[PDB]
Amino acid sequence: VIRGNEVSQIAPGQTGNIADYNYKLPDDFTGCVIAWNSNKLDSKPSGNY
Amino acid sequence: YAWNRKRISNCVADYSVIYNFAPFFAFKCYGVSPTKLNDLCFTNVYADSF
Amino acid sequence: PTYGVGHQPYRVVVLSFELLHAPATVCGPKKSTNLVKNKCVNFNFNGLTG
Numbered sequence A: 001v002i003r004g005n006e007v008s009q010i011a012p013g014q015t016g017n018i019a020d021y022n023y024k025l026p027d028d029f030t031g032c033v034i035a036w037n038s039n040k041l042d043s044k045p046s047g048n049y
Numbered sequence B: 001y002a003w004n005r006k007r008i009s010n011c012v013a014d015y016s017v018i019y020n021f022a023p024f025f026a027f028k029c030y031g032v033s034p035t036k037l038n039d040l041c042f043t044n045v046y047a048d049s050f
Numbered sequence C: 001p002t003y004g005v006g007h008q009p010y011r012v013v014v015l016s017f018e019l020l021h022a023p024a025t026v027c028g029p030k031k032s033t034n035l036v037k038n039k040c041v042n043f044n045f046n047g048l049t050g
Ligand SMILES: *[C@@H]1O[C@H](CO)[C@@H](O)[C@H](O)[C@H]1NC(C)=O
Pocket: B020, B021, B022
């Protein structure tokens, strides 16, 4: 689970916060990335920590 | 029709706080890429808001 | 839930196929056919045609 600003960061050839320190994909990667919004299930009014 | 232009100069620009300041999706650039903006540098930056 | 559309949580599932070098284990739904020889036929061996 990531934030909405960094969904496009899950791609071959990306740098920053998620792609450099958390989850890096190879340059010659073959496969599919499936992302969808989960604001109903993974959010709380007090703040999901 | 009366868009405001702000001149940015004589400073150090960090582009990683743009995602923190505003809740957008795509940082859509044309002559550059979003991930390489912190390495090289420019003369002047203008901001146009409407 | 009061945040903007760029700060919503997102679930990401990444499927990572590896191309065929070892004998194939996972394959899609297709009916197999009897093997014929010494004839000009179109073949399909583990997804590659000819
Ligand atoms: C914008 O500025 C106001 C006033 O300084 C502040 O209360 C608000 O939190 C700021 N917004 C963000 C996203 O930081």
